[PDB]
Design a protein around this motif. Structure first.
Motif, PDB file in Angstrom:
ATOM      1  N   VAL A   1      40.138  28.882  23.066  1.00  0.00           N
ATOM      2  CA  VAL A   1      39.128  28.597  24.105  1.00  0.00           C
ATOM      3  C   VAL A   1      38.747  29.866  24.919  1.00  0.00           C
ATOM      4  N   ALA A   2      39.564  30.913  24.812  1.00  0.00           N
ATOM      5  CA  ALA A   2      39.287  32.189  25.455  1.00  0.00           C
ATOM      6  C   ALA A   2      38.717  33.131  24.399  1.00  0.00           C
ATOM      7  N   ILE A   3      37.392  33.257  24.380  1.00  0.00           N
ATOM      8  CA  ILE A   3      36.675  33.978  23.322  1.00  0.00           C
ATOM      9  C   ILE A   3      35.605  34.881  23.947  1.00  0.00           C
TER      10      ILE A   3
ATOM     11  N   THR B   1      33.380  32.596  26.554  1.00  0.00           N
ATOM     12  CA  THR B   1      34.024  32.156  27.799  1.00  0.00           C
ATOM     13  C   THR B   1      34.439  33.282  28.739  1.00  0.00           C
ATOM     14  N   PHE B   2      34.315  34.526  28.287  1.00  0.00           N
ATOM     15  CA  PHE B   2      34.448  35.689  29.156  1.00  0.00           C
ATOM     16  C   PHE B   2      33.665  36.833  28.542  1.00  0.00           C
ATOM     17  N   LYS B   3      33.366  37.855  29.336  1.00  0.00           N
ATOM     18  CA  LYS B   3      32.639  39.007  28.846  1.00  0.00           C
ATOM     19  C   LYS B   3      33.274  40.259  29.398  1.00  0.00           C
ATOM     20  N   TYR B   4      33.014  41.384  28.733  1.00  0.00           N
ATOM     21  CA  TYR B   4      33.512  42.679  29.193  1.00  0.00           C
ATOM     22  C   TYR B   4      32.521  43.267  30.194  1.00  0.00           C
ATOM     23  N   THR B   5      33.028  43.873  31.266  1.00  0.00           N
ATOM     24  CA  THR B   5      32.170  44.587  32.233  1.00  0.00           C
ATOM     25  C   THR B   5      32.805  45.923  32.611  1.00  0.00           C
TER      26      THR B   5
ATOM     27  N   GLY C   1      35.976  45.376  34.429  1.00  0.00           N
ATOM     28  CA  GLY C   1      36.918  44.634  33.585  1.00  0.00           C
ATOM     29  C   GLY C   1      36.377  43.254  33.248  1.00  0.00           C
ATOM     30  N   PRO C   2      37.126  42.462  32.442  1.00  0.00           N
ATOM     31  CA  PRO C   2      36.615  41.173  31.956  1.00  0.00           C
ATOM     32  C   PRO C   2      36.396  40.153  33.061  1.00  0.00           C
ATOM     33  N   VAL C   3      35.365  39.323  32.902  1.00  0.00           N
ATOM     34  CA  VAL C   3      34.969  38.301  33.875  1.00  0.00           C
ATOM     35  C   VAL C   3      34.677  36.996  33.120  1.00  0.00           C
TER      36      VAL C   3
ATOM     37  N   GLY D   1      41.581  30.868  35.076  1.00  0.00           N
ATOM     38  CA  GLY D   1      40.875  31.692  36.038  1.00  0.00           C
ATOM     39  C   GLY D   1      40.134  32.809  35.347  1.00  0.00           C
ATOM     40  N   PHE D   2      40.750  33.334  34.319  1.00  0.00           N
ATOM     41  CA  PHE D   2      40.172  34.437  33.586  1.00  0.00           C
ATOM     42  C   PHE D   2      38.827  34.026  32.925  1.00  0.00           C
ATOM     43  N   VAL D   3      38.769  32.791  32.455  1.00  0.00           N
ATOM     44  CA  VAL D   3      37.626  32.255  31.797  1.00  0.00           C
ATOM     45  C   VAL D   3      36.614  31.631  32.782  1.00  0.00           C
TER      46      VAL D   3
ATOM     47  N   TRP E   1      48.026  38.529  23.509  1.00  0.00           N
ATOM     48  CA  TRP E   1      46.815  37.736  23.362  1.00  0.00           C
ATOM     49  C   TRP E   1      46.692  36.827  24.564  1.00  0.00           C
ATOM     50  N   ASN E   2      45.647  37.047  25.343  1.00  0.00           N
ATOM     51  CA  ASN E   2      45.344  36.256  26.512  1.00  0.00           C
ATOM     52  C   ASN E   2      46.576  36.141  27.413  1.00  0.00           C
ATOM     53  N   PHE E   3      47.085  37.318  27.773  1.00  0.00           N
ATOM     54  CA  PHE E   3      48.163  37.472  28.749  1.00  0.00           C
ATOM     55  C   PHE E   3      49.512  36.900  28.342  1.00  0.00           C
TER      56      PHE E   3
ATOM     57  N   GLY F   1      46.156  45.786  25.243  1.00  0.00           N
ATOM     58  CA  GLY F   1      44.937  46.540  25.460  1.00  0.00           C
ATOM     59  C   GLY F   1      44.953  47.246  26.805  1.00  0.00           C
ATOM     60  N   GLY F   2      45.287  46.494  27.850  1.00  0.00           N
ATOM     61  CA  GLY F   2      45.384  47.036  29.201  1.00  0.00           C
ATOM     62  C   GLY F   2      46.743  47.633  29.463  1.00  0.00           C
ATOM     63  N   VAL F   3      47.011  47.890  30.735  1.00  0.00           N
ATOM     64  CA  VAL F   3      48.293  48.413  31.203  1.00  0.00           C
ATOM     65  C   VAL F   3      48.966  47.404  32.154  1.00  0.00           C
ATOM     66  N   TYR F   4      50.137  46.892  31.763  1.00  0.00           N
ATOM     67  CA  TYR F   4      50.850  45.847  32.517  1.00  0.00           C
ATOM     68  C   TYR F   4      52.308  46.204  32.782  1.00  0.00           C
ATOM     69  N   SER F   5      52.795  47.337  32.303  1.00  0.00           N
ATOM     70  CA  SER F   5      54.239  47.586  32.279  1.00  0.00           C
ATOM     71  C   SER F   5      54.848  47.764  33.667  1.00  0.00           C
TER      72      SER F   5
ATOM     73  N   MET G   1      45.392  51.119  25.094  1.00  0.00           N
ATOM     74  CA  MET G   1      44.554  51.552  23.978  1.00  0.00           C
ATOM     75  C   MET G   1      43.123  51.081  24.101  1.00  0.00           C
ATOM     76  N   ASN G   2      42.946  49.876  24.621  1.00  0.00           N
ATOM     77  CA  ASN G   2      41.621  49.352  24.833  1.00  0.00           C
ATOM     78  C   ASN G   2      40.987  49.883  26.100  1.00  0.00           C
ATOM     79  N   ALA G   3      41.779  50.102  27.135  1.00  0.00           N
ATOM     80  CA  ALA G   3      41.280  50.786  28.346  1.00  0.00           C
ATOM     81  C   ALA G   3      40.852  52.231  28.083  1.00  0.00           C
ATOM     82  N   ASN G   4      41.420  52.859  27.060  1.00  0.00           N
ATOM     83  CA  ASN G   4      41.181  54.259  26.807  1.00  0.00           C
ATOM     84  C   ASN G   4      41.234  54.539  25.305  1.00  0.00           C
TER      85      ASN G   4
HETATM   86  O1  LIG Z   1      43.005  48.016  31.500  1.00  0.00           O
HETATM   87  S1  LIG Z   1      41.785  47.193  31.699  1.00  0.00           S
HETATM   88  O2  LIG Z   1      41.667  46.881  33.145  1.00  0.00           O
HETATM   89  O3  LIG Z   1      40.582  47.953  31.267  1.00  0.00           O
HETATM   90  C1  LIG Z   1      41.878  45.817  30.867  1.00  0.00           C
HETATM   91  C2  LIG Z   1      41.543  45.810  29.507  1.00  0.00           C
HETATM   92  C3  LIG Z   1      41.624  44.620  28.793  1.00  0.00           C
HETATM   93  C4  LIG Z   1      42.031  43.429  29.428  1.00  0.00           C
HETATM   94  N1  LIG Z   1      42.100  42.228  28.696  1.00  0.00           N
HETATM   95  N2  LIG Z   1      41.319  42.087  27.726  1.00  0.00           N
HETATM   96  C5  LIG Z   1      41.258  40.965  26.883  1.00  0.00           C
HETATM   97  C6  LIG Z   1      41.555  39.706  27.394  1.00  0.00           C
HETATM   98  C7  LIG Z   1      41.516  38.577  26.578  1.00  0.00           C
HETATM   99  C8  LIG Z   1      41.162  38.623  25.208  1.00  0.00           C
HETATM  100  O4  LIG Z   1      41.125  37.477  24.440  1.00  0.00           O
HETATM  101  C9  LIG Z   1      40.807  39.934  24.579  1.00  0.00           C
HETATM  102  C10 LIG Z   1      40.438  40.059  23.230  1.00  0.00           C
HETATM  103  C11 LIG Z   1      40.130  41.328  22.707  1.00  0.00           C
HETATM  104  C12 LIG Z   1      40.172  42.479  23.512  1.00  0.00           C
HETATM  105  C13 LIG Z   1      40.529  42.386  24.864  1.00  0.00           C
HETATM  106  C14 LIG Z   1      40.861  41.141  25.442  1.00  0.00           C
HETATM  107  C15 LIG Z   1      42.366  43.430  30.780  1.00  0.00           C
HETATM  108  C16 LIG Z   1      42.290  44.625  31.494  1.00  0.00           C
END
Ligand SMILES: O=S(=O)(O)c1ccc(/N=N/c2ccc(O)c3ccccc23)cc1
Ligand SMILES: Cc1cc2nc3c(=O)[nH]c(=O)nc-3n(C[C@H](O)[C@H](O)[C@H](O)COP(=O)(O)O)c2cc1C
Ligand SMILES: Cc1cc2nc3c(=O)[nH]c(=O)nc-3n(C[C@H](O)[C@H](O)[C@H](O)COP(=O)(O)O)c2cc1C
Ligand SMILES: O=S(=O)(O)c1ccc(/N=N/c2ccc(O)c3ccccc23)cc1
Lengths: 210, 210
Positions: A117-119, A123-127, A130-132, A170-172, B102-104, B147-151, B185-188
């Motif tokens: 459901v998170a696609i 249901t969300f887009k890149y900006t 960051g994603p919204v 919330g993410f979606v 995948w999706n947190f 993709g992001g940074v969560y550590s 990797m996805n952030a940069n």
């Molecule tokens: O580090 S970032 O703030 O730029 C950041 C990058 C990616 C991010 N999450 N991205 C996804 C979230 C959910 C999904 O199903 C995705 C699928 C493919 C690629 C990214 C994501 C959150 C923060």
């Protein structure tokens, strides 16, 4: 108003605390809104494809501009079922989730469902920042049954099913959520009938304002 | 020393950042300890029964004192695969988990696996104060690609796969756990190869002390 009653419990309302409360919610909601449509999606009897090699291969073909007939039969079955779940979810106005806590989280199939459901682009887009989320006009309720007590205080930190679910919603874009806990039955088995009735009453009142 | 290399990625080391790092870890570890036994459990090609109505029914029969022949065929297949995963897990000394975010959180099959391996009277027991683990002498490593940074910092709070996994491991008695993130990797995307190589180097060093 279209409501999805999404359950992840292998037992019915006769043998599950969460299902008892969820059915009380849903009945009370139907009485208040007779014209609302309520569809049950039992995640233990719904095909909810895990993201796997077939799915990634299918997505690769769609990204290459290829069409549905480029997929193998198994790939087609998986993507068709994923698109169905996604479309059903995007088009509903209200989500009610019923889950038990198993090992500090929800049943695996809840995660599989959230991965359907998170696609991106749906249901969300890149900006820039960051994603919204893309979903507007939605509301959710999570009813979770737990042996212990996790709804407030220190143990809230290990309520991973609750917290992850709220996060993905919330993410979606579904930031309007409600939560009902049916909790402490295993910590206090002689109080279990009272805990259930109090949660039933709480659900019935919420049904009049959800 | 018996090591389980448990992977939950539908791609191999050639197309997954986590798998690249996990492979580098595990091969460096074998080379350091040639006599150690390393079994790979690929969760995308292992039967890992979800807990469902069949499983609850099967458990009810065991709790009533009945034997394996009281189960239906499907129940027998599910419980046999669940016992195999549990036994394999209890008897190993070390666990290495490889997951993508995948999706947190992790892929659903990680949760299904934890639901196979966290079992009352086998890997934890009920106590006055609450449940405690039965497993002693174990060590785990989680390698997670994101993709992001969560550590570290604020986004750690939404690293649900990492945090839930550690929690369940701790709960079953594995409190000695290591963590390697392959992140950002996805952030940069231009830095992705450098991020991968740095994580490969970190895994190769850890292998000498794990
Ligand atoms: O580090 S970032 O703030 O730029 C950041 C990058 C990616 C991010 N999450 N991205 C996804 C979230 C959910 C999904 O199903 C995705 C699928 C493919 C690629 C990214 C994501 C959150 C923060
Ligand atoms: C496989 C399994 C795992 C469970 N894990 C937990 C847990 O981690 N924490 C907890 O407080 N209760 C746990 N319980 C107890 C349940 O959360 C409790 O029985 C709950 O009411 C189940 O939901 P239901 O009654 O709607 O089916 C677990 C129960 C089962 C069957
Ligand atoms: C279905 C899917 C969901 C994802 N969800 C997130 C996410 O929630 N947060 C994030 O930072 N990256 C997310 N990503 C990006 C991946 O975590 C990243 O690509 C990582 O490299 C995947 O691990 P792997 O390369 O070992 O397969 C997601 C990617 C996919 C395919
Ligand atoms: O409120 S309590 O402190 O007594 C408490 C109760 C249950 C609890 N978790 N119990 C379980 C944990 C894991 C499982 O796989 C279970 C299976 C059946 C019943 C309880 C649990 C933790 C704390």
């Amino acid at each position: 108003t279209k409501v999805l009653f999404i359950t992840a419990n292998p037992n019915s309302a006769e043998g599950s605390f969460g299902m008892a409360v969820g059915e009380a919610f849903i009945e009370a909601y139907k009485n208040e809104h007779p014209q609302d449509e309520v569809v049950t999606i039992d995640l233990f009897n719904t095909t909810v494809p895990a993201i796997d090699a077939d799915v990634f291969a299918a997505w690769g073909k769609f990204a290459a501009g290829e069409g549905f007939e480029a997929l193998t039969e198994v790939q087609q079955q998986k993507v068709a079922a994923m698109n169905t779940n996604l479309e059903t979810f995007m088009n509903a106005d209200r989500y009610v989730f019923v889950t038990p806590m198993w090992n500090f989280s929800y049943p695996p199939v809840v995660k599989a469902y959230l991965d359907n459901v998170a696609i991106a682009g749906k249901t969300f887009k890149y900006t820039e920042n960051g994603p919204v989320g893309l979903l507007e006009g939605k509301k959710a309720l999570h009813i979770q049954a737990t042996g212990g007590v996790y709804s407030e205080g220190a143990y809230a930190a290990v309520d991973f099913g609750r917290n992850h679910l709220k996060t993905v919603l919330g993410f979606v874009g579904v930031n309007d959520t409600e939560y009902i806990a049916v909790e402490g039955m295993n910590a206090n088995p002689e109080k279990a009938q009272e805990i259930k009735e109090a949660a039933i009453a709480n659900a019935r009142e919420l049904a009049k304002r959800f």
